[model samples]
Target chain A: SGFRKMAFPSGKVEGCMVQVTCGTTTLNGLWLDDVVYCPRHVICTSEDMLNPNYEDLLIRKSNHNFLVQAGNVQLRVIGHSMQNCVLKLKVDTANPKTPKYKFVRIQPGQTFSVLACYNGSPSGVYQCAMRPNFTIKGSFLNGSCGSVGFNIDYDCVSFCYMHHMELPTGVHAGTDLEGNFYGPFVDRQTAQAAGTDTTITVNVLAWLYAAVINGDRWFLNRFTTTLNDFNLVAMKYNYEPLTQDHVDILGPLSAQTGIAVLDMCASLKELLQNGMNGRTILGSALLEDEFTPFDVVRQCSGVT
Target chain B: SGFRKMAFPSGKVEGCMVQVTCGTTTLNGLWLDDVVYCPRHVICTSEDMLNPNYEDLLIRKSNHNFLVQAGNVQLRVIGHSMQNCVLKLKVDTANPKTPKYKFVRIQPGQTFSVLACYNGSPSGVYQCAMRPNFTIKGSFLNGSCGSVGFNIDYDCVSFCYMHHMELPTGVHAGTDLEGNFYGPFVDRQTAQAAGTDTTITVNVLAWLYAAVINGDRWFLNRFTTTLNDFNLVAMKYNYEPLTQDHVDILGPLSAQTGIAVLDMCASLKELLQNGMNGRTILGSALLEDEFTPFDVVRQCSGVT
Candidate 1:
């Protein structure tokens, strides 16, 4: 099959290329031209290959290869939260000793998400930047994701749509706040200690945690690697927390949007807190006993 | 239309069919035999009519109409809550002054619900019980209703599935040792102190106030009588906390199931806590978010 030309928002890759990745399947070098044919891939356009704009174009570099125990922690923040926030900051490892701040701001009501990369592996070295305004506590997630995406969403405020009464298997813990109801977090010292099998060098901001339902299918698997230093891949994805506003846009739930809800927290968060086990949600977070998330899976799937 | 053979699991109404409820309907004199024709309702079975069992039987009783205001504070307990409980007990008018020892044990993990008859009417009475094992708090909910269950199954042990970032429009407050959160309690002296309201006769159990969502559809509207006493209804439903164990039997969710979960709380204590608004829920407590409740509308709606 001729590789279906993959499309991404413009300038996605500064160097004029595109990336298709899931857990462990990172297909790079896709072309933007029709004149040159790259072996085993698609052809390229002459203008794309010869134009000065193309020549001057610089491919955005990312060092996201740094992985967590299981894989990179991907946190998709939805834009419906009334308050603005910055996704977890990735400490640049160019100089592991001197931490560099890296994070993206999520404006109020901006429905998008940023992947979180915290790998609590013996070789995993990273930091969760702590902001002064909010009290930040990190924990080795009692839990987080799955091979196939999940859609449990709990917000700081409002009713959750998740109707589960118990937790499913393969789930552990989750959240931006720790030691709260559903979580039992390890210390920052313990998290940093992960990389050296002793203690972390950086001040505690967030903890390293790695847990998912389907090991191989996890989105992080593709970016899985030791961030022994920093974001080796410098990954980028267009996503956000699945917010209530977003849920509204998707419209009221239906038979297909089984677990749909108007919400804020992540899907995994719901699974852990409710003790609900073994169920797939097909809805938004603004939900009830009948409500739900997954991202690309949602985009690719026929979900609304 | 023939009256739905007032369904109740067997033995639901022990005495003979002593009651018939409907729109301007009453056929109390109708014989149990097919020979009698009850107008605008269902036909009588000759066997059920002439049978000695029916002759020897007494009409079923409700105790349900019993109600409470600050004057009739009634605390209804389920028979199984890790411990046996009375469905309802009104702190009687006889010395609404002397508080009775009206309390029961909340057995561990025994999941079930009791009918909450708070009218939500400004006239609705309120009371919160205080037991040696747990502190309880109370507030009136400005809500309840509708159907369609849901399930995502998150738990208190994990981040919740609730995704709403902002609190919904109508959310009140509540509590118990569990089922509740953000509460311990202050006492009626304080509650009535809440509004330019009336004084409630004291009872050792649950508190009350008045709040509601769709007033017309609330179930309490039907059961709103002064319990004047207790356990007259002695009702039971074959149910338990929609625990993790029951989750599997559910399978993937659909829009039909409305009460989805994001996590669990200490149990009934939570259900008692959130003092919610606008929706009726039939489950255990720990909760977050602006939610819905179950009641009169639920009563009128036929099975989905």
Candidate 2:
């Protein structure tokens, strides 16, 4: 039979004749008790066709569920100067019955890690804080630090540390060749102990990885160049001798050039010790000379 | 006078020694050749001071060589329907051997005076042109006409005359009550013979002033109202009628409210009519009817 002329048997597609009820009303009923059949084609009866009842054809699929994990918590300390410092961490547990963890007495430039556990209860928060250590020299830089609190059920699978150290007083780094009024370190250990040296460390927790890196090269270079330019201009105008504040401003130039202020001074001192004439270094040619030595140092230091 | 403060014995300012020269050679004999003295306060020696010489000082007293006189010139023609028609005036005196005059036309709607003679010659130019007598038709029931051109001179003086009619068509004034068309008064004799019945002897030039003053009322009230509101709305929607193009586009409300197009049209027309309805009377209530009565009559009479 042609498609338009064909007629299907009535009971072939029979299913349950179910009654859909909402509260006190029966919304609809179908035949066959358990084998109701829905017709594919139906004629609309109303002229306005304001309302229509059709089966919702779209089938909804189930959604997946995941358990987020909170793992290790870590802290990093950044010391701006040679001063005593402390670190603190605060945690909030999921249940009121759960105990909180606290780790104390952490020193400057030190990192601390602790296991962060949450009872899958899906409700908890965690946080960390840092406090600076006191100095015996009667100079103390005290401050409290904290991070945004997070729920225990929320995943914190990794931790990382970073510290930014501020250059000390009298650290002249400009082209002025004027040394800052500070005692020089006798060894690398002493420099490290003073927290003036750069440090880098990597930590991994759960599936997360983080690396903390530090460097003083940029700070020193900018400081030194600024000091040198300022002094040259000041001297041309017959201004007073450069001061510590002036040196402080100039010290970052050396760091910027990937050259420490102390190292720059030491290099010049070594050249002078080798019997190089002071007049040659002081000549206008030396002052006016341009060089790409700092750019090369920057490349070697792995900095732009 | 430790130096320059030293006084002359007579207590009068003395002339400083100055040399005079004709071209490069110095003249020494005449007083005019030598430097003459003035009171110190009368002649400022300051470099910033502006000094006026004889010519500059006498300029305010000088008389302008230009002279002007006002007079009228008349051109005669015999016709009908000359009202509101511009008349072109031309003086044909091109022979240079004889005193020549330039022809120029005066603009309508400007305050002007005719110049009898200008610069020792007859001041002549194309004076003005009136709408030809056959250009317009007046009906016993309606009166309507269009503007003829007028020109303005540089002096802000306007001068133009209608081509004089021996006998004018239609009386100078009155209204068309039944929409009866009248016109085609050929010559002066015919116009006079027809007299009060079919002729209108109007100052064709003055008709412009009348139309300017009153024609907008006839246009807005008569022409605007006859169209269906639906057609107006359709024109407004499809054509986006400009407020300036069709005063009615502002809508009946605004037209009646005296704020939009209708108010401006009425005010301008009032100014043109000079507050008094002339021989051709137009009533304001025609606009209330929402139809252009004058336009209908004009169309019926075959007047554009």
Candidate 3:
């Protein structure tokens, strides 16, 4: 049987010399030359032997041992019944991270062959080792292989959205004489503390007041005046009330004002009634069906 | 051709009693009805016929003269056909208001059938008229048909739903403001004048002030105090602020107050800015971005 030769892209081949040690069976062998390996596995050379570039020389060994040479590379191995054995060549570069090596599995009784323009790298070196189990577990340095490199890309971060600034405060209470309920505002202290801001704050307070004493003609009028004042100040400062712009603002303002006013009205009614009333005052008929008078007052005043 | 007797839902033709006479075009020496007339065009039966319940029948002379039979009730000419020139049956009851006649045009050489439903206090009577010119007419009594009597469902108006309620002078102005912006209310005077005893007039001004200044604080405190006073006075006279229940009494009050407050706030803002600010104020970093010194001061002054 003759040994098969392997070829690669580059014109050079490492380990062109083939050496086999005999076991027990005498065998007839052919010259295996011009075998090539990738960059990561090339190690030795046949240049040291005579007639290193001989292509068609044949050799016979007693067992399975024989020597065949070609080019400047060499290969040496020992085996018995070598008829079924496979010869594999590999090339390895010094850096394990690059020049990846892959081991391919072949089925029994299969033959491998390759056709190429060149043997390997121009200044290549090669090393030979026996792979009894069909796997090579050694590393090697690469000689003169073609250049391989890479490129990269990236992205950056951006800016845009935000939230509103106003805060709310107040009290709510019940107004009936029976003391059946408490006002939206817990107490007078809370109401005063909430309303103390002299300018626009007071205007907001007045709005609360009107909302609370919805039916009280006098209180409603006063509340209107305060609202006007607040509006005037907001206008002067170029701060438009959010309520005027959208339904969202109006809804919250309405709810809060409603609660406070209810509490205030209820508390006032309670005080005037000398603890005679038991119910709370509510801001609007719109809310009447949804809430009890006391409950409405409590909600408006920011109370449970 | 032998005179063909046609039967209609309005009435049946007795054999030989009525004959078809075609003018100038006699077939086999037989005359065909040449003129078509409806019940409306024929006079009704005279009272001397003696049978009060007898139905009025129409008769047509060969020359196209039509007459109503005696003793038959006036059957509003229900329908007619000009194709066979003869007046048919009639129904009682007629009024021009809601005319009972419908005119239909038909093409020459095309056969047409008349369809009609009985419509009179007694629905049994019905008739249709067809003309050789391919025209058909139908008549009906507006409300006289059907086995069932007419009925209309009525709903009672509630206090909340009532639109007319007189508000106090100042109260009127504030609530009117609500109407002005939302429309429907021409002005404050209009709202006030339109308000009635059952109407609930809410003062939005007070609620607006309370909300801006913080609800439970000033407004609630004042409202409760007033309510207590009103109750005390009521107790002294065995009377109250319209009602003993806080909800019943303060419901309208709270509503009015809220309306007034909202109105005041809206107007006040309008007054202060004179509505001159532009979208730039909102978009500019001065107001929208981080708070500036002016923003701080404005907020401190309750402008925000």
Candidate 4:
């Protein structure tokens, strides 16, 4: 009896009554509620398994529906051509971790672009010092779920960190190709000839501006890599098995960082119960924090 | 040579016993498998593999298991505001192609939200050609995956396609000192008498209406950028290295022209038994004519 596809949240794994002790019967996460005599899933309600204040738990195991999709986050901007150029490239939806200042416009064949993510802002912001060298930014493309930017080192903006703005653009840096580097684009004599190739950037536009002030890329890709990182997160898959051994193994997905803090605390209480003052609310993130629903409704919930 | 991650059935990769030239270590695409020289994957008693093919395959080489996990699509929506506001915005079911629509309604604060996804038929219609200048809709402020539009020109909507349902309550094109615009918002003297600055728009509304019914946030960030601009043929991301050599090589992932035709014959009984209704469900073009699954589910399949 092994069933593990866990990232469990919604669904009714029956108000809670799960128990998997594992030496080997194995049922680590959850999912399997056709009810095979004594098998089902979900219901932790978070409550932190008994402490930590983490929150009640209901991570996953399963019943079946679908949406468990997350981890897409992209940012691949390449163009060193001032001559082959089409400038004006404004970014930073809004302080998605300092989405730099601004500038927008681009046309002329084009080198790269894979944007379109807000509420579910998988990831964004790649201000490798606001990209000036050969015009291609966001480096070090690695692999693995949250995946992004890895080894696109043209010394990537003099050792990067011009305040930092979210890097990693769906990365996988494999080739150096005579040091031309093409994780996406790195020209200007191959990003000034690598100059020591350090490789380490993934700002993700301040986590896509903290994923739209907290939809947190739609609850960690709709709950842990869209229902547990591609299910065959194997101990088992056709049925399930991630194994629990003892007891304390909650879930595999819980990083929906800023899935837009309760939709900006209900639009900061309906724009402060309709007092809606000075008027200015365009998004990505205008920055205020606590997931800024207009400064959590007029700075730290002061509201109307 | 052995590998397996099979779930095959999306488009035609082409029949069994298939083989290709200009290489060594051969192993072409298979709807099922024949299994030879210890190099095994799948067959499941399902036998079918013949004739004219599409070979020289290795799609990707790596350690074996399965749960390659890929598939999740979404599109849902609910707002239209630019002066007829009802603000409340909330999104992020987790990157089913950026699901976040609007819900305008606010007084001192619209709180926070950048939602606007449609054709879940959950809702549709949001047009704010609100141009006093600079074009780009899909607003509210989410993140910046493909986040283009953000204060291009202004008076934006003499200010816009304002059907009016939920409008900005948290905006700040910041720079009013000598600004260009914000709202029908004209600063810096009507953004300096609105000049030539051409405003090209694209904000991926609810992931283009969830790629017309689910390409889950437009198929892995739009076929990873559409089979990475047509894998130029592309996969292998274990720890890292999505690579190989190339005459025009592209990715560690390819086939966005309908992701290779319904993954090739999953028996739906011989693709619905040539039940061949109205003489369609064809295969190999049935002559392998681009391996049809409704024309790979609809014109080289362009999902959301």
Isolated chain A TM-score, each model: 0.18, 0.15, 0.15, 0.16
DockQ of each: 0.01, 0.00, 0.01, 0.01
Residues forming the 10-long window of minimal summed lDDT in candidate 3 chain B = B155-164
TM-score of 4: 0.18
In candidate 4, position A181 carries an lDDT of 25
C-alpha RMSD between model 3 and the true structure: 43.3
TM-score of each: 0.16, 0.14, 0.13, 0.18
lDDT of 3 by residue, B1-304 (tens): 0000111111111100111122221110000132122222122233412332212322332223322221132223334332221133322432222212222222221111111111111211111112122221111121111111010111110000001112332221101101111112221223223222111111112222323232212222222223344434334433223223323332343353453322332332332234223221211111111122221222222220
Candidate 4 lDDT by residue in tens digits, B201-234: 1111111221223222212222222323222211
The sequence of per-residue lDDT tens digits that candidate 2 reaches over residues A20-44 is 2212222111212111111111111
The most accurate candidate by lDDT is 3
Ranked by TM-score, top first: 4, 1, 2, 3
Stretches of candidate 1 off by over 4 Å are A1-304, B1-140, B146-304
Which ranking of candidates, highest DockQ first? 4, 1, 3, 2
Interface root mean square deviation for model 3, in Å?
A: 55.0
Worst 10 residues of 4 chain A by lDDT: A1-10
The predicted structure with the larger lDDT, 2 or 3, is 3
Off by over 4 Å in 4: A1-209, A215-304, B1-170, B175-181, B185-304
Q: What is the lDDT, from 0 to 100, of the residue B44 in candidate 2? A: 18
Alpha-carbon error at A82 in model 1, in Å? 26
